[PDB]
Design a protein around this ligand. Structure first.
Ligand SMILES: Cc1ccc(N2C(=O)C(O)=C(C(=O)c3ccccc3)[C@@H]2c2cc(Br)cs2)cc1C(=O)O
Length: 123
């Protein structure tokens, strides 16, 4: 049975660069997937999408649209100390949080900084 660490590694092995917004999306898909016992269907959708010729980036997005735990779901909140805890390759993807962010519309997560600042990571 696939673990969350295993799934993260499989997905990472298909992504170019490191610490990009897509890497963070893998983290969120894996966390939310573990918590909803859905790692197997997520892995299956990921592989099916690649097998059809989709880019791995499109495969990750398709998961947010096809797997029901992500459908019309709010992005998870992740508490951090400062913007420095976010990878360099994510920095330009950080945005002010809109009123009703949804994962399946590209809002991967919401970082909540110690001093109260809040930033959404957008794909
Ligand atoms: C199954 C799983 C997947 C990923 C993680 N994460 C980590 O251990 C971790 O460090 C995660 C991050 O994405 C992260 C990114 C930047 C700064 C801090 C955390 C990341 C998180 C995803 C979400 Br949604 C909340 S934390 C944790 C778990 C877990 O079981 O604790």
């Amino acid at each position: 049975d696939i673990s969350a660490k295993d799934l993260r590694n499989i997905m990472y092995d298909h992504l170019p660069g490191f610490g990009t917004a897509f890497h963070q999306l893998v983290q969120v898909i894996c966390k939310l997937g573990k918590d909803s016992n859905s790692l197997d269907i997520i892995h299956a959708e990921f592989q099916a999408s690649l097998a059809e010729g989709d880019s791995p980036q499109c495969a990750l997005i398709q998961i947010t649209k096809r797997v029901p735990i992500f459908q019309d779901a709010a992005p998870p909140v992740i508490h951090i100390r400062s913007r420095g805890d976010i990878p360099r390759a994510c920095q330009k993807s950080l945005r002010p949080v809109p009123p009703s962010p949804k994962i399946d519309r590209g809002w991967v997560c919401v970082f909540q900084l110690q001093d109260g600042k809040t930033l959404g990571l957008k794909i």
